[PDB]
Write a protein that binds this ligand. Structure first.
Ligand SMILES: *[C@@H]1O[C@H](CO[C@H]2O[C@@H](C)[C@@H](O)[C@@H](O)[C@@H]2O)[C@@H](O[C@@H]2O[C@H](CO)[C@@H](O)[C@H](O)[C@H]2NC(C)=O)[C@H](O)[C@H]1NC(C)=O
Ligand SMILES: *[C@@H]1O[C@H](CO[C@H]2O[C@@H](C)[C@@H](O)[C@@H](O)[C@@H]2O)[C@@H](O[C@@H]2O[C@H](CO)[C@@H](O)[C@H](O)[C@H]2NC(C)=O)[C@H](O)[C@H]1NC(C)=O
Ligand SMILES: *[C@@H]1O[C@H](CO[C@H]2O[C@@H](C)[C@@H](O)[C@@H](O)[C@@H]2O)[C@@H](O[C@@H]2O[C@H](CO)[C@@H](O)[C@H](O)[C@H]2NC(C)=O)[C@H](O)[C@H]1NC(C)=O
Ligand SMILES: *[C@H]1O[C@H](CO[C@H]2O[C@@H](C)[C@@H](O)[C@@H](O)[C@@H]2O)[C@@H](O[C@@H]2O[C@H](CO)[C@@H](O)[C@H](O)[C@H]2NC(C)=O)[C@H](O)[C@H]1NC(C)=O
Ligand SMILES: *[C@H]1O[C@H](CO[C@H]2O[C@@H](C)[C@@H](O)[C@@H](O)[C@@H]2O)[C@@H](O[C@@H]2O[C@H](CO)[C@@H](O)[C@H](O)[C@H]2NC(C)=O)[C@H](O)[C@H]1NC(C)=O
Ligand SMILES: *[C@H]1O[C@H](CO[C@H]2O[C@@H](C)[C@@H](O)[C@@H](O)[C@@H]2O)[C@@H](O[C@@H]2O[C@H](CO)[C@@H](O)[C@H](O)[C@H]2NC(C)=O)[C@H](O)[C@H]1NC(C)=O
Ligand SMILES: *[C@@H]1O[C@H](CO)[C@@H](O)[C@H](O)[C@H]1NC(C)=O
Ligand SMILES: *[C@@H]1O[C@H](CO)[C@@H](O)[C@H](O)[C@H]1NC(C)=O
Ligand SMILES: *[C@@H]1O[C@H](CO)[C@@H](O)[C@H](O)[C@H]1NC(C)=O
Ligand SMILES: *[C@@H]1O[C@H](CO)[C@@H](O)[C@H](O)[C@H]1NC(C)=O
Ligand SMILES: *[C@@H]1O[C@H](CO)[C@@H](O)[C@H](O)[C@H]1NC(C)=O
Ligand SMILES: *[C@@H]1O[C@H](CO)[C@@H](O)[C@H](O)[C@H]1NC(C)=O
Ligand SMILES: *[C@@H]1O[C@H](CO)[C@@H](O)[C@H](O)[C@H]1NC(C)=O
Ligand SMILES: *[C@@H]1O[C@H](CO)[C@@H](O)[C@H](O)[C@H]1NC(C)=O
Ligand SMILES: *[C@@H]1O[C@H](CO)[C@@H](O)[C@H](O)[C@H]1NC(C)=O
Ligand SMILES: *[C@@H]1O[C@H](CO)[C@@H](O)[C@H](O)[C@H]1NC(C)=O
Ligand SMILES: *[C@@H]1O[C@H](CO)[C@@H](O)[C@H](O)[C@H]1NC(C)=O
Ligand SMILES: *[C@@H]1O[C@H](CO)[C@@H](O)[C@H](O)[C@H]1NC(C)=O
Ligand SMILES: CN1C=CC=C/C1=C\NO
Ligand SMILES: CN1C=CC=C/C1=C\NO
Ligand SMILES: CN1C=CC=C/C1=C\NO
Ligand SMILES: [Cl-]
Ligand SMILES: [Cl-]
Ligand SMILES: [Cl-]
Ligand SMILES: [Cl-]
Ligand SMILES: [Cl-]
Ligand SMILES: [Cl-]
Ligand SMILES: [Cl-]
Ligand SMILES: [Cl-]
Ligand SMILES: [Cl-]
Ligand SMILES: [K+]
Ligand SMILES: [K+]
Ligand SMILES: [K+]
Ligand SMILES: [K+]
Ligand SMILES: [K+]
Ligand SMILES: [K+]
Lengths: 527, 527, 527
């Protein structure tokens, strides 16, 4: 029986055997009042507190969300769908501690992605028991609100202020500050880590003054807030809230009466209509995301970043080799996860339409131009590959590299990686390569489980990554110091060194995607 | 109804519609005991406090002052005359806040000019509603005492210690520190800004130890305390107080009995005699201004500046292209706002007499010499232009550039601008060019009001200036980061870069007025 | 009668005449509960406190330990054996203060070596009365637990957590912080100094967060924790504890029941079996030493050192010219303290077997190769000398120089010495040279006693060393500033300057043992 006294009550955990050792898991501890009834759309409220023992022995409810049903029965898509009941009653977190109870362990706090529309902390690829066992860190993860229920904005109005899901995450950070020493953690050594929208969230906490004192450093996997999908403009946010109203029969005259009406809808009706609040979506549509609310976010974040207004600390940032490929099969014509997706020039042009819906003809031709000067054989896969690169470079890689340059210009150490290993168990086809999301299971140490049908070389890669992330969280320096490893140099504007992560040889390289990012970063924004 | 509880009582504001939005204005909140009866000539005393609601719904009384009556019915002069009743009962301030109430907004505090003899915070060109609306800053402005009633000095004697108007401003700064969080402002992010005597005041607050903790940074428009008009010497101050006495029938034997007598005069009689306390005035006469009082100002300010004794923070400093022209029509012979003011050599010589009344013949010939080596056509406008430059370079531009070099030599970032746009609505004639005072309406965002008959290009210039001032106040760096703008480089001794502000093209230039300032700065002071 | 009131009670000291002066000695003051019965194998517990006067007038019990009986009646070995009764009741310390009582004296705290298996603070060569007399420092020394009784580890289990002897030392450091001002010492000026395992201990206190605030700087004589003998791996520690159990009839099923059984054994039975817990020992066997316990030591120390996680302060580090020789006569074939120990190639090879028991054949040939390329005469002493160097360079000199480079790379000043004087009274034979342990009596100032049959030149060397150590403790800079002495330069990576200590001439030299350490440091660890 392991019981820990927290500020709000007693919690009971469960013991787990991992690699001949023990980890104690506390799954589903509440960290805020359930955001129901009058509380829907509002900032999370602090927990009232319980007498008696809260059993933290199973994953809690995942937040209300639309689900991926493009490939029923297929593991590659369905591994990302929630594996616990959906409910508005979803503001819970999880804690994995080493056994025996550590004395003053560093804390790793995971923030999942899902485009701010989906996701949950109970997914198998986010299981923190391996990190606790192997590195003796404490790992914490929280569910936070998504879609309209997390990000509906009527800016300035506390009935629906925007950014509720970000405040959900922030309230979980406070929970760690107030309670983690009781689990043997050191609230003075907290590193946030997150992937995609989770990484964009970590980047916004670096910018939010209310987050400054709730963490020590940060890790950003495939995302950052200056990614084109990551921040909804004030204008878009109001169009979308008003469209949503219109669709659910809630258009009113008094804004506060819009929200009161929206609070009477059942969750399904809000969810069903989320997809249509936008005139034309792309596969990366973020219908309801972060906004400049005047509260979590005090100014346009591009301006904070440019002018050096953010927490000064170390960062670790990276991307995967084929970020853009996952998205091509959710709409681009000629693509299929069940064939080699050889597409023609014309199909390419149509795919740009699908990914760049509000862009002038000239804007689109300029992309075609940058990406189709072939070298040079007339390889049939030319167009298929160019479309993946386009989608990945614009949406993930160039914004990651740009955030890292700008962050590092104000004096702090930064480290940048390029992940190029394709999982031997990947259920998606070969042409899709080193996909978006498929470093996560390396970071969490799944391939350390020998029973799991990953190769020996994958075991070793995961062990080295887990060590580098852990050393980064504890010491600010993502080195593996014992096994004659390649030193990971700081990323500086000017040299722009990065480290490649793969099974064969680890390399120091310079100026990732230099020609492509010059296009996305200095020209495309004018278009 | 918007009511805010302050340390001294409740205040009610009014709502205003600005650009489809709302700003709440609190106009005329008192911030000190009325300086009447026994309190005339003394430091401002702290506010006793009220029960009930103070209605802050109209501009308060402007301080006692002489008025400009050189051009009755002419908007160019009369825009500067007070637009509320004059009264010794004038120590009030104004607050504009964005709607809805901000969370922790930066604060901009305006200090008006008027040679320390005139001015008021209720003028149309100082209206803070546009800054609040557009940039979501809070804007504060205060009336402070002017002329003998603000600056009469009998140094060392608390019945009339000097610098009362500066202490008035300082007491308004304290009011912001104590009360602004209640209006949603951040007392830890206060930038002072001021023009001409208002800018000279901002520069003296940088030097005053009692002001150190009442603000974060500073903006100086066309003025700084080392301008020749800006600080009255101890000797001049005593001559002037004694002349004033003599004129009002108050000469006594006991200094304290001089002041007691002066306290029995009605305000008009003090004002009527102010102009004559000086043997010969110039159009820029500052009969009663700042002094070294041993209190606000602990030593001669030239010495503090030289030896690095001032608040260390960032500054933004600038001047207009034709600072000196406004003054030529208040006395220089051959000048008129109603003709082209072509003057001869002889008239030039006479104008130097008018502007440089106590200067040796050699002193005057040396100016003539520096400014009349023509290049070269015998253009009729030669003498008219040289006189404007003379007046502007000596009184405004060279002291601004010298304060910026000296300030920046001790390590802090400084930014310097040269404003060269002439308002399309300027009621003064063409020959007077880009006049002193006529950047103010750009800084306050008047041309953002489309109804107002300014051009499209003026709208855009004002929007860019308002952004740069706002970014300076919030972040210390006067950049406009979103619209491919020219970066404003720091001003360093050695390179001396500055930014030009105009409608056509923004430029980085070096060493403004280099030859002229070498004359004013290193030679003229010996003369 | 000298009585001093401490936090736990009154202590009485005794007066001693030293060099025509007086020192007050407090010998045997307790500083923790006696670690007996249920307390055996546990962290030291805080002292309960006494009413009445504790007589601190004789050395206390030395801790339980095996004794050196290789040369009964021989002073060279027996000078190192305890000179007070052995007892588990041994947690006492000693204080020497100058007379009269100083006002705010620097404190020197000695930690003895003995491989963590042996040693005691009452040995004649550790007598602090000369340092107090000559330099007016206060000197403190503590007994701490050794062998299984100090270092038995079942990691994670507080019944036997590991590192008890290190916690013993740490608890004595706290005692100095709480009580030394009462003896006239300055708890803000504490330097630790230690030799061999004592120096390794000082190096681990630099790494232990709980030691950070208990001292100012550090001195390391012939030892540092990255020496191959100095830290037991987690794996070895468990093998050894389980072997010990097996040998004493204490194997159980419940680990806690192993320790309860071990607590019923008499000390002799634990000691008798210590030597056998290891399959094959070397003469430098550390059967029970420091471990990564998660408490004193939060990670593998090689990793802390590499990544800059340690107290930032100055260090003084050094070694003796023939560190390895003492060990050759405890097992290497052909060696004797009673003859010239000329050995053959074959005997060399056998000696490598004795010193490098778990090393591959290739590992051993590589040592033979590095150390036997003769220059060049076939001198008979070739093999005898190479074996001493091998043992000394691997175990002492190269780890000392490597700790100093790594420590200094993070910004702090470091000073490195090479001691090359052989005591004129050394009872060991000539071939053994400048032996391990035989700088101690110079540091403690024994040769300042003229009655003692050391030479005049030895008197002067000791006086200069004592001054340099004292200046290091007080001022962080080990200079002798009055007698035209050679300046001791800081040791920097890159130049690697060190100071030689000898009777003839003091020299600045570079890159000690450069070729040998490249072998031990960059190649041998792979083997
Ligand atoms: C690869 O598959 C795509 C995807 O569309 C198809 O999925 C296939 C696996 C196929 O068996 C069929 O069931 C389904 O329509 C093919 O794209 C389709 O191309 C066909 C031409 O016959 C058109 O009818 C469709 O417009 C088009 N569908 C979409 C959604 O774009 C594609 O031709 C095929 N490519 C290969 C084998 O290289
Ligand atoms: C520009 O005007 C000045 C200003 O003085 C005059 O104002 C004029 C608009 C004019 O109509 C008249 O009412 C008024 O006197 C002229 O300066 C004046 O020059 C005249 C010469 O006839 C003299 O009588 C005055 O001394 C002088 N006045 C002052 C105050 O200096 C000036 O000549 C004229 N210049 C032009 C047209 O270029
Ligand atoms: C130096 O002495 C060693 C040590 O062993 C011996 O100690 C001597 C002082 C000697 O008198 C004797 O009592 C004792 O055995 C000698 O090593 C020994 O060599 C002899 C060869 O006769 C062998 O019998 C032993 O194996 C060996 N002993 C050990 C422990 O190694 C060594 O030969 C001698 N060397 C000289 C004089 O150069
Ligand atoms: C947001 O404002 C309008 C909203 O119109 C929308 O009605 C909603 C309730 C929703 O169902 C949504 O699908 C629909 O668009 C947008 O107007 C669009 O623009 C086209 C222009 O050709 C018009 O035909 C429609 O009004 C509408 N489009 C479609 C396909 O029906 C408006 O464009 C949008 N703002 C943006 C994109 O910035
Ligand atoms: C200040 O001290 C005297 C004051 O004399 C003045 O009487 C005042 C009440 C006032 O009305 C003022 O206009 C008048 O000047 C100054 O003396 C001046 O110097 C000239 C020298 O030729 C004398 O004729 C007068 O006393 C007076 N001037 C005039 C035009 O009347 C004194 O110069 C001044 N101090 C300065 C300028 O530094
Ligand atoms: C630690 O684990 C075993 C323990 O075996 C030991 O039994 C103990 C109680 C003790 O007396 C000790 O001397 C003895 O070794 C080690 O096994 C050794 O390896 C050899 C391999 O040839 C075997 O013959 C024995 O089991 C044992 N050696 C001897 C000489 O008896 C084991 O190797 C050790 N772990 C290490 C060295 O890492
Ligand atoms: C928590 O679990 C234990 C049984 O495993 C039980 O005793 C306790 O009552 C539980 N609490 C519940 C079901 O609320
Ligand atoms: C944990 O470490 C911090 C510094 O990072 C320290 O201040 C704190 O007191 C430690 N807490 C423990 C050992 O409980
Ligand atoms: C709208 O209704 C709300 C909520 O009942 C009320 O508080 C608010 O004053 C109203 N505003 C307007 C403009 O009607
Ligand atoms: C280091 O050593 C061995 C390989 O020789 C391996 O088992 C272990 O995983 C490595 N450690 C890390 C952190 O990569
Ligand atoms: C302030 O204004 C309101 C009316 O608009 C009034 O109720 C209140 O009495 C006023 N206070 C005065 C006139 O003192
Ligand atoms: C406003 O910002 C400051 C730092 O500039 C901070 O210390 C303060 O507490 C903030 N106040 C709020 C959000 O009310
Ligand atoms: C002058 O009168 C004042 C005010 O009544 C008095 O306090 C002061 O002592 C007097 N001083 C002289 C020198 O007469
Ligand atoms: C930036 O964008 C547009 C012009 O393309 C304009 O409306 C806006 O005023 C500009 N913003 C600023 C701060 O100058
Ligand atoms: C300590 O020593 C003195 C005698 O020298 C004595 O008076 C006192 O009783 C002693 N304490 C003991 C023996 O406990
Ligand atoms: C001893 O020196 C320290 C500084 O090293 C000082 O703060 C302390 O108060 C001094 N104590 C005395 C003289 O008792
Ligand atoms: C072993 O015995 C100890 C001490 O009596 C007890 O506290 C512990 O729970 C037991 N553990 C096991 C696994 O038997
Ligand atoms: C310095 O001076 C003399 C030798 O001339 C000597 O007695 C003394 O020991 C020297 N001091 C030190 C600290 O070496
Ligand atoms: C659907 N999804 C959501 C978050 C992160 C990854 C992801 C899929 N990636 O291929
Ligand atoms: C008369 N005046 C007073 C203050 C600032 C400007 C001003 C007029 N300027 O032309
Ligand atoms: C046996 N011993 C223990 C600690 C320090 C030195 C020592 C002997 N050295 O030769
Ligand atoms: Cl084409
Ligand atoms: Cl850093
Ligand atoms: Cl390069
Ligand atoms: Cl002439
Ligand atoms: Cl600065
Ligand atoms: Cl230049
Ligand atoms: Cl051989
Ligand atoms: Cl230092
Ligand atoms: Cl060299
Ligand atoms: K690539
Ligand atoms: K282009
Ligand atoms: K010009
Ligand atoms: K001159
Ligand atoms: K040597
Ligand atoms: K080798």
């Amino acid at each position: 029986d392991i019981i820990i006294a927290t500020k709000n009550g007693k919690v009971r955990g469960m013991q787990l055997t991992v690699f001949g050792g023990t980890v104690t898991a506390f799954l589903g501890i509440p960290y805020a009042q359930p955001p129901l009834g009058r509380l829907r759309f509002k900032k999370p409220q602090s927990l009232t507190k319980w007498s008696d023992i809260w059993n933290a022995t199973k994953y809690a409810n995942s937040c209300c969300q639309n689900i991926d049903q493009s490939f029923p029965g297929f593991h590659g898509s369905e591994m990302w769908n929630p594996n616990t009941d959906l409910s508005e009653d979803c503001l819970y977190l999880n804690v994995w501690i080493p056994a025996p109870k550590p004395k003053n362990a560093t804390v790793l706090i995971w923030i999942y992605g899902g485009g701010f529309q989906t996701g949950t902390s109970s997914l198998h690829v986010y299981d923190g028991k391996f990190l606790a066992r192997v590195e003796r860190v404490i790992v914490v993860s929280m569910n936070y609100r998504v879609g309209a229920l997390g990000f509906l904005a009527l800016p300035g109005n506390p009935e629906a202020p925007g950014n509720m899901g970000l405040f959900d995450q922030q309230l979980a950070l406070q929970w760690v500050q107030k309670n983690i020493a009781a689990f043997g953690g050191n609230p003075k050594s907290v590193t946030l880590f997150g992937e995609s929208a989770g990484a964009a969230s970590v980047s916004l906490h670096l910018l939010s003054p209310g987050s400054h004192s709730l963490f020590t450093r940060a890790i950003l996997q495939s995302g950052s807030f200056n990614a084109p999908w990551a921040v909804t403009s004030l204008y878009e946010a109001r169009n979308r809230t008003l469209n949503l109203a219109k669709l659910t029969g809630c258009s009113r005259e008094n804004e506060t009466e819009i929200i009161k009406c929206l609070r009477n809808k059942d969750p399904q009706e809000i969810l069903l209509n989320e997809a249509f609040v936008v005139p034309y979506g792309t596969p990366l549509s973020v219908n309801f995301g972060p906004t400049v609310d005047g509260d979590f976010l005090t100014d346009m974040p591009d301006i904070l970043l440019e002018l050096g207004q953010f927490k000064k600390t170390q960062i670790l940032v990276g991307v995967n080799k084929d970020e853009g490929t996952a998205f091509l099969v959710y709409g681009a014509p000629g693509f299929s996860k069940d064939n080699n997706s050889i597409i023609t020039r014309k199909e390419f042009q149509e795919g740009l339409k699908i990914f760049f819906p509000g862009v002038s003809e000239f804007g689109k031709e300029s992309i075609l131009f940058h990406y189709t000067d072939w070298v040079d054989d007339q390889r049939p896969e030319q167009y298929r590959e160019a479309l993946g690169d386009v989608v990945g470079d614009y949406n993930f890689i160039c914004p990651a590299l740009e955030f890292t340059k700008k962050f590092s210009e104000w004096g702090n150490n930064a480290f940048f990686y390029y992940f190029e290993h394709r999982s031997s168990k990947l259920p998606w086809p070969e042409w899709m390569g080193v996909m978006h999301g498929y470093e996560i299971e390396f970071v969490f140490g799944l391939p350390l489980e020998r029973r799991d049908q990953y190769t020996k070389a994958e075991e070793i890669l995961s062990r080295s990554i887990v060590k580098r992330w852990a050393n980064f969280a504890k010491y600010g320096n993502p080195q593996e110091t014992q096994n004659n490893s390649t030193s990971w140099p700081v990323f500086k504007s000017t040299e722009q060194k990065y480290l490649t992560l793969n099974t064969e040889s680890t390399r120091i390289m310079t100026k990732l995607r230099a020609q492509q990012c010059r296009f996305w970063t200095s020209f495309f924004p004018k278009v």
